[PDB]
Each structure stands twice: as C-alpha cells, then as structure tokens.
Amino acid sequence: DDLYRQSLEIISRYLREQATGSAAGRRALETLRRVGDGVQRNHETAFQGMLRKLDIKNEDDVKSLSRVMIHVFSDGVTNWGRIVTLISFGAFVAKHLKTINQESCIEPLAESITDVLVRTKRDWLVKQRGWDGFVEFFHVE
Amino acid sequence: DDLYRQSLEIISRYLREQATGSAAGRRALETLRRVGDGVQRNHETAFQGMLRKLDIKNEDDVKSLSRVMIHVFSDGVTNWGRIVTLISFGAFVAKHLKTINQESCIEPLAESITDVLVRTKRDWLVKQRGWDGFVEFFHVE
C-alpha cells in the first residue's frame, strides 16, 4: 500500500508532465526525467513502430499495454532497465493519447503501469529499496 | 497457446483426480502426482491453516488464490519448487471445494492457476523446456 501510493505518485507525475509540460520521490522524478527522456529519444522510431502495432484507442484502453509489460518480465528476469523502459514507453503512449484527444487523462494509464509493477514485483522492489534503489542505480556524476 | 492448452490439460487432470479418485504430459502427470502428493502430505497442517486464512467460498472464487500465487513470485525468483508447490496447494484447495460441495468443479480453479503460471512465466517455462523440463527436474531413480 505504501509502495503503491508512492509509485503511483511518481509515475503519474512523470506521465502528466510528459503528456503536457510541467525524499526519493523528488530524486526519483528527477531521475525518471533524465533516463525516461533518453529512452524515449534513443528509441523514438522503435517506440512509434510499437505504438502502431498496439491499439490503445483512448485513456481507458490499457489492457493491451498491461499484457505487454507482463510479457516483458515473463522470462523471470527483473532489473531497473526494464522497469524504467516500460514507464518511458508509458510516457510515450501518454503523449500519443493526449495528441489524439487533448482532454484525455493519463491517470488510468499510470495506474495500470503501477498496478503491474507493484503487484507483480512488490518483494523485489522492496528488496531493491524501492525508489531509493531506483535513484541509486541510475545515479550519474 | 500451445503451452497454455498443454498446461491446462495437465493441471486440470491432476486437480480432477485429487478432488476425486482416478509424451511429457503422461510423464508430467506421473511426476505431478508423486511430488504434488508429497507436498500436500508434508505440509497438510500448514495447508489447512492457510486454507483457513483465505476464503474461497466456491468453484468460481479464485481471485483470492490468484493474488497468492502472484505474490509468491513477486520477489523476482522462479523455480520448479514454487510452481509445483502452488499446483499442489491448488489440489489441496480443490479437495476442499469438493468436500463442501460434491457437485462443484475444479475446472475454474485449474484455469486460474494455469492463467497465472503461463501468462506470467511463459518465456521462463519455454526456456526451461516446459513440462519436459518439469519432469527432468523432479526425476528420481
């Protein structure tokens, strides 16, 4: 519950800022921006292609994306690279949904991403020290 | 799809035989019996206690059990010990549901177990050679 709310907060705020323009949580958002933005840049062409293959017709259509994320981890491997890649693809998708409909919300998207992440990887996240661990892994000097 | 149907078959048949009395698939069932029965025996007291904590009021009530299984793997670790333990606990639960209602079916239970297993661990199962890998891991001489 604690980890859910904290994750929802961070992911939601990132997707909101991405769809528009706006402790660890501050650090986590600052890290999510740097890494997530880079992911989206390096892989823009690929991301657009994937967006073409999937559907997502509106704000509420997330079931498609959920299956994609669940399939990402189905090989039994977990790491921060994968978690942040999926969030960044979520941000990319949030941008797309806002373009087609300027008064759609990211809130359902962010909850679906959070849901998968937290429900499927709760103990791993806890062992990795949650968002503090996220910040430390991507830390640069 | 192939792995889903094959897994559904094996898990369903095991739970059916457990709730009542009746290639790799034959070997897998033969292995599932030996290991699954032993799990249930060694841990009968513990299994009964867990059954007390959960609810499962009938055949269709599986959402509770699904969350338990998903939480088992949330630490990011996968192995056959866990997969077969969950199936055995599923068999134990199938026995319980049949006792309270002699004309209830295991079919929804087996599908929920299969669903979690296959959807969340598809690539891992494939890399472990599916049910052939299951048979080999528990092989005794």
Partner: peptide, 19 residues
Amino acid sequence: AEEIGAXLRRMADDLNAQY
C-alpha cells in the same frame, strides 16, 4: 503484443547493461 514485449526487453536489458 507479447512479442513488442520481447523486443522492449533488447532495449531495456541492453539500458541495463549502459548502467
């Protein structure tokens, strides 16, 4: 769907090994 999943998993694992 599953199989854009596997090819997010090229880009993530090979981000994971950048860090």
